[PDB]
Design a protein around this ligand. Sequence first.
Ligand code: Y01
Ligand code: Y01
Ligand code: Y01
Ligand code: ZN
Ligand code: ZN
Ligand code: ZN
Ligand code: ZN
Ligand code: ZN
Ligand code: ZN
Ligand code: ZN
Ligand code: ZN
Lengths: 318, 318
Amino acid sequence: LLCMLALTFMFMVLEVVVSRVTSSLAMLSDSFHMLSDVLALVVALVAERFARRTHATQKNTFGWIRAEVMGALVNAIFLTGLCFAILLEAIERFIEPHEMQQPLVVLGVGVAGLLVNVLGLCLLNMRGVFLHVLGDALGSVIVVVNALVFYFSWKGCSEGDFCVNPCFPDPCKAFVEIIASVYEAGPCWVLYLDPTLCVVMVCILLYTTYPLLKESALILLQTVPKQIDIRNLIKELRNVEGVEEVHELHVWQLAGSRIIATAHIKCEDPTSYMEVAKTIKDVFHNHGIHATTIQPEFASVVPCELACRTQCALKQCC
Amino acid sequence: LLCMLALTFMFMVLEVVVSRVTSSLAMLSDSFHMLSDVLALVVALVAERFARRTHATQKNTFGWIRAEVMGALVNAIFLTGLCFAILLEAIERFIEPHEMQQPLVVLGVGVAGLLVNVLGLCLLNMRGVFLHVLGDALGSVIVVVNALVFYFSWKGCSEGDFCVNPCFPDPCKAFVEIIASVYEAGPCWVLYLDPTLCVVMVCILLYTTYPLLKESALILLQTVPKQIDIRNLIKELRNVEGVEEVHELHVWQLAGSRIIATAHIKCEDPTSYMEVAKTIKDVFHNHGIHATTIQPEFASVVPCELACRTQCALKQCC
Ligand SMILES: CC(C)CCC[C@@H](C)[C@H]1CC[C@H]2[C@@H]3CC=C4C[C@@H](OC(=O)CCC(=O)O)CC[C@]4(C)[C@H]3CC[C@]12C
Ligand SMILES: CC(C)CCC[C@@H](C)[C@H]1CC[C@H]2[C@@H]3CC=C4C[C@@H](OC(=O)CCC(=O)O)CC[C@]4(C)[C@H]3CC[C@]12C
Ligand SMILES: CC(C)CCC[C@@H](C)[C@H]1CC[C@H]2[C@@H]3CC=C4C[C@@H](OC(=O)CCC(=O)O)CC[C@]4(C)[C@H]3CC[C@]12C
Ligand SMILES: [Zn+2]
Ligand SMILES: [Zn+2]
Ligand SMILES: [Zn+2]
Ligand SMILES: [Zn+2]
Ligand SMILES: [Zn+2]
Ligand SMILES: [Zn+2]
Ligand SMILES: [Zn+2]
Ligand SMILES: [Zn+2]
């Protein structure tokens, strides 16, 4: 983990610095994606370290096990925020285009990123990581092809001869239009490739990270998992022996694949309660739910036999 | 709520657009703060709309009560991401200083924001809103004083007269040293003022948003609330004549003041369980807990009388 984490972090630092100095948007977006990747590795390591020894902690009774889910959510939404900022910068660049400072350094960092992804390729359990590395390499080669197209087409100028087309506003009024030799700059295919390509990059990043963010948000919010069917479960619970009807059923996913159930039941006879709670355990275990807790209300218009009279209707769940 | 929402959103759009036009970072940070405020209002409205008709939906058995807290976390982390982008821009501006484009429009939008905050004042439950609007007004004061100081002190050349600037690199090297020696006034107190005020603004935003993010994170992660002491509660539960030992006790907060408790008690005398259950209800209602699902495991090699046959990968918590 750390063996690639350190390399990715150091490359991220240099990449961010040189990109924002050179002020090229697609490069900045690719560096932000590498930033999201390295923070994903960081949160994965933190979650593994915390989950290695989870117990009945004084502060957290359940344990810091939702750490991986919350880290995924934080990374996804942090990337979304940075991507929104980058899109705002791209719109600003549409407002007033700027040329690339130096294609040579951009090509160098692009091939460096390509080599970084190639090295990471060597290091679906591993196929998912390989696909993520391939997507990062795709972003890197998009940066590289941007650099190539800019270098091959943008003839530009480096002398005092009239070179800048009216599309690009002249710097410092071009010395009041020199108060020289006639020259025409590059065609209308550059000075716009960088932002019109960074928008594609940011759109693809948003499309890739939306399902992960949605899944993490649904996990963090108390939502029944798609695997468990609430209607089938409630109907099958009603169709048991010794139980009249069930209420206050709460089912939610904690993290990964450990589901917690909660319900209240009523039994006709207090005697011989066992072999009935065993039936409830078996029927819950039949579905994906494994950790349960069933409170019996022993045997009428009142919904639940156990309710504090002086209770904030709200405070009491549902 | 929407009456101020529409005005705030329209002003946010205008200020963001004009700030990106003029490239002023302090105004950009203030606009980001306004964006955070309007998004907070939006999430509050949607949370109230969802909470007005909270029901045991098939997808969400608990209900979308946690929507407000999730929106608060989303806003806090989005603001943090935008603030990180702002720090990147500020470090860039330290690397290469750029002067403000048009002080007049910046002063106009600053006084417009001040008037917006004044109208907000015109329109703890309300003391918190007063504190927030006073903070936003303070940010507007920062941006307007930045504009005022830049306008009065800066004396950059506008015409073709000589202006030797060592502070900022001249565009096109001033026609390559031109291939009325007017000197600028106080470059130190002018060029660097905007990025440093932006850094101060973003630092104060981080300081004022960190506690909210921490509380929201502790709410989403299943953490015992600071109001309830878990050790005292378990000691009182153990100090009950009916129950022998209490195991698998989980306490967590849903949203606001809604605490749900879970326990696996073991007791004898099946015909008198309800006598114990009333005592458990009373002792839980003594603390902040108001919703419990105490499951009696009726009668020490095995800790819990009910358990999965395989308990694969100990999905069941603890
Ligand atoms: C790319 C940008 C967003 C910077 C990311 C930096 C991370 C490496 C930082 C940000 C938040 C940090 C965490 C914030 C809080 C804590 C709790 C801390 O536990 C304590 O000792 C708590 C002490 C207390 O507050 O009482 C251990 C480090 C940790 C996990 C930090 C680990 C390092 C983190 C993830
Ligand atoms: C071009 C500029 C102005 C940026 C535009 C941003 C949004 C208009 C885009 C970015 C990502 C898009 C989302 C990417 C993915 C999806 C999932 C897609 O299908 C699903 O909901 C689930 C698909 C699946 O998982 O198979 C519906 C459209 C949606 C929400 C897209 C809606 C439009 C979004 C938010
Ligand atoms: C501007 C850039 C370059 C640096 C930004 C640094 C911030 C992320 C740091 C600087 C000072 C820090 C604060 C210094 C002191 C505290 C008090 C302390 O918070 C509490 O009060 C929690 C404990 C309590 O319950 O009293 C720890 C977090 C906090 C807000 C820190 C949060 C992180 C801050 C804002
Ligand atoms: Zn990646
Ligand atoms: Zn099971
Ligand atoms: Zn009940
Ligand atoms: Zn109560
Ligand atoms: Zn309930
Ligand atoms: Zn505000
Ligand atoms: Zn038990
Ligand atoms: Zn447990």
